[PDB]
Design an enzyme around this catalytic site. Structure first.
Site, PDB file in Angstrom:
ATOM      1  N   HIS A 148       0.260  -1.273  -0.004  1.00 20.90           N
ATOM      2  CA  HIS A 148       0.367   0.162   0.100  1.00 20.90           C
ATOM      3  C   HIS A 148       0.633   1.458   0.093  1.00 20.90           C
ATOM      4  O   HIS A 148       0.352   2.472  -0.018  1.00 20.90           O
ATOM      5  CB  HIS A 148      -0.805   0.106   1.025  1.00 20.90           C
ATOM      6  CG  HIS A 148      -0.133   0.457   2.412  1.00 20.90           C
ATOM      7  ND1 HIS A 148       0.723  -0.861   3.523  1.00 20.90           N
ATOM      8  CD2 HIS A 148      -0.243   1.368   3.129  1.00 20.90           C
ATOM      9  CE1 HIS A 148       1.661   0.346   4.338  1.00 20.90           C
ATOM     10  NE2 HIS A 148       0.747   1.912   3.696  1.00 20.90           N
TER      11      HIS A 148
ATOM     12  N   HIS B 256       0.933   6.963   0.524  1.00 23.76           N
ATOM     13  CA  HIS B 256      -0.024   5.600   0.100  1.00 23.76           C
ATOM     14  C   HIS B 256      -0.840   5.325  -0.411  1.00 23.76           C
ATOM     15  O   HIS B 256      -2.234   6.491  -0.948  1.00 23.76           O
ATOM     16  CB  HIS B 256       0.002   6.408   2.185  1.00 23.76           C
ATOM     17  CG  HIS B 256       0.538   5.822   3.602  1.00 23.76           C
ATOM     18  ND1 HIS B 256       1.679   5.187   3.494  1.00 23.76           N
ATOM     19  CD2 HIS B 256       0.016   4.989   4.326  1.00 23.76           C
ATOM     20  CE1 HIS B 256       1.628   4.674   4.638  1.00 23.76           C
ATOM     21  NE2 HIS B 256       1.027   4.349   5.171  1.00 23.76           N
TER      22      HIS B 256
END
Length: 162
Positions: A68, A83
């Site tokens: 991620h 992110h």
């Protein structure tokens, strides 16, 4: 006097737009670190395309723990933290596929991740994909231009400028 339209023709501050979707100020991100800027300056993209290219690849600085997120560097001046969505970390990237097998030194754009946003979304509280720039050559304000929708590989979307 405050000539906002400082777009420029070559308005590509080593930023070939990473994703297609909707840009939102960093403050909008449902997380203290991102929301309060903490580590640097940046912005959020609420993504649409499950294909994520890089603003700059340059040199991958660090890998994703759970696919991620990633750490990048242009040359030596702009170090980036990414992110992808929120709680995706918790989701263990269930629906993610990583394109960079972080072979550090690379040229811009060329897909970092492919990500099943369609299936990820219902499994997360937010799709906010924040991008922060830390060092920012100790003075580059992240001057967002495209204060609305964004598309991959575009120019004059955000300008890292003094």
């Amino acid at each position: 006097m405050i000539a906002e339209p400082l777009q420029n023709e070559i308005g590509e501050e080593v930023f070939v737009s990473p994703i297609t979707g909707e840009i939102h100020p960093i403050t909008d991100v449902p997380d203290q670190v991102f929301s309060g800027k903490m580590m640097g300056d940046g912005f959020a993209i609420l993504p649409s395309e499950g294909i994520v290219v890089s603003p700059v690849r340059g040199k991958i600085l660090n890998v994703f723990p759970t696919k991620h997120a990633i750490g990048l560097q242009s040359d030596g001046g702009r170090e980036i933290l990414i992110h992808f969505g929120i709680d995706t970390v918790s989701l263990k990237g269930e629906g993610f596929t990583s394109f960079v097998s972080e072979g550090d030194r690379v040229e811009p754009g060329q897909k970092l991740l492919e990500v099943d946003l369609d299936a990820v979304k219902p499994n997360v509280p937010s799709l906010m994909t924040p991008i922060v720039f830390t060092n920012l050559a100790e003075g580059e304000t992240v001057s967002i231009k495209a204060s609305g929708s964004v598309n991959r590989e575009q120019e004059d979307i955000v300008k890292i400028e003094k």
